[PDB]
Amino acid sequence: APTAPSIDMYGSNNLQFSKIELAMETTSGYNDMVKYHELAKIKVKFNQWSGTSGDTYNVYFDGVKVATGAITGSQTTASFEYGQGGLYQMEIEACDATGCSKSAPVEITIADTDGSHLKPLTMNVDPNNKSYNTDPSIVMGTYFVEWGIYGRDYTVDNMPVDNLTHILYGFIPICGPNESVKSVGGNSFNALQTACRGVNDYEVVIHDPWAAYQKSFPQAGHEYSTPIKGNYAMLMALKQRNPDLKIIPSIGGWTLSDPFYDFVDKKNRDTFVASVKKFLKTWKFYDGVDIDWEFPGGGGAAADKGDPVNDGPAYIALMRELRVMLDELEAETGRTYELTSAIGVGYDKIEDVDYADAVQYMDYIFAMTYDFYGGWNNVPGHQTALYCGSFMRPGQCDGGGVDENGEPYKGPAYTADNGIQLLLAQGVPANKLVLGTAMYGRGWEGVTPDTLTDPNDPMTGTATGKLKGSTAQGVWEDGVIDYKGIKSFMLGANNTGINGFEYGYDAQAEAPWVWNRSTGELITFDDHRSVLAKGNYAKSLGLAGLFSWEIDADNGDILNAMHEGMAGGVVTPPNR
């Protein structure tokens, strides 16, 4: 007396209460599927069927009073709000003037999107990824792709997190013009139309809610009724394991950049910046935002887009206004938020943005020092080289030369160093630049020995088309192959070549190749040596560190070599 509350355990997903409502077993518009609440609504039914009811109840979490209210009669509903996610030991107590009696304790879960209710994620990482003691100042970045969980079968728990400082999550789309998404075929454009139903143009949405939060991952302990699932629940648990990990959503990319070209109208930036603030309030494991606008001024997937007059000032303004917004979130939350961007480094991309201006709002620029050459045409070259290759013509490297038809080069050749120097020369600080590493090759076929102008160098040949292969080989798209695929099908464990491929390296460029003389297949990629050279280069220049696209395509070798090449190095972190 009063009789002790007895808690009705049924009808509340095992006393799991979530700050976020996520539609399950359906795909619909983003605003229909996801609803976040600053306070979780907690409802607990208890009864008291024998004896005295009492007047008032108290709820305790781990022995601390968190709520109070009136006992109704022999069955009451405890009803209150709670902000802090976590697992708690709950007891419900009933009181009158004679005394108090409490229920047995029971575990309650309040789910939040920081993973505060989650144990540290159990990892399953390829043991070929080694341990290193790289100084924590240095960036060690990679992209994890949302769609990597299907045929690529590579999931949040496979990531070598201890070897990473930054995980960039590709990709968050923007609602609006998105015809470039059609390039990918399959259901990707249609999925985005669905996600955007009922969403204002220029607002961010989750492209694939199945992958992001609906799919149950048994390696993460997910059950079908778990309130948050998918990659997102796993990234939440991953940050419980490595609290210093920075996880940042990457907006745009190659096929998702079309809406960016309408940011010349401030009204659209305003709509975008506001939706990003809300996305970050909703999805708390995220530590800022990365803008991958490919590209201010054009030259991206959309041939009918790009304005070299207006896009640069739009990008700068975008950065300015995103930084004002993240400073708000910082004031509101007490956390630190980073603002980053992946950018083209061809001279004709750099010249369209005044980065001396932009960079003051930014923590890091991810210099996309890859995709210099590839299967879109029949011209071999080093796709991710530091320096000018031996294949290049006299004056090709600095742009003063003329091509084979006597026509002038329009600018310096596509190499990582030409791009970095252009950036530094404008006043972009070295400690804000992160150098890109490829975890993939680009490739051709038809490059047989008779096409070569220098018989020692297949970069002087001519292709007949793109490299072809199967997904099991890591060829997910013609002319592109996962690094792990090159290792399995071209290098072999000793790196001396298998399946009729030979290995070669251009010492001047700092760039490897593998070439099968008989099929004419030629692949340009990053290997251990070229990545060690990129780390050396980053050390010499005082760059922020290295990042890579994309970790699912690595087998440990690239990330390991990223680490090895920065051994001993330290950098000054930036300020925004």
Which residues carry out catalysis? 294
Q: How far is CA 568 from CA 138, 200, 490, 565, 571, in A?
A: 10, 49, 32, 9, 11
CA atoms within 13 A on the CB side of 92: 31
Nearest to 296 by CA among 250, 262, 334: 262
Contact 20, 37 (CB under 8 A): yes
Separation between Cα atoms, residue 102 and residue 158, nearest integer Å: 45
Separation between Cα atoms, residue 320 and residue 260, nearest integer Å: 15
Q: How far is CA 129 from CA 247, 311, 436, 548, in A?
A: 20, 40, 19, 15
| Residue 225 CB coordination number (10 Å) | 11
Q: Burial-class residue 342 by CB neighbours within 10 Å (0-12, 13-18, 19+).
A: buried
For the chain, the first-to-last Cα distance in angstroms comes to 62
Written as six digits, the tokens of 323 are 């930084």
Beta bridge pairs of residue 106: 90
Separation between Cα atoms, residue 321 and residue 291, nearest integer Å: 13
Contact 19, 106 (CB under 8 A): no
Nearest to 77 by CA among 89, 88, 69: 69
Pairing of strands 56-61, 40-47: unpaired
Quote the longest CA-to-CA distance of the chain.
Answer: 102
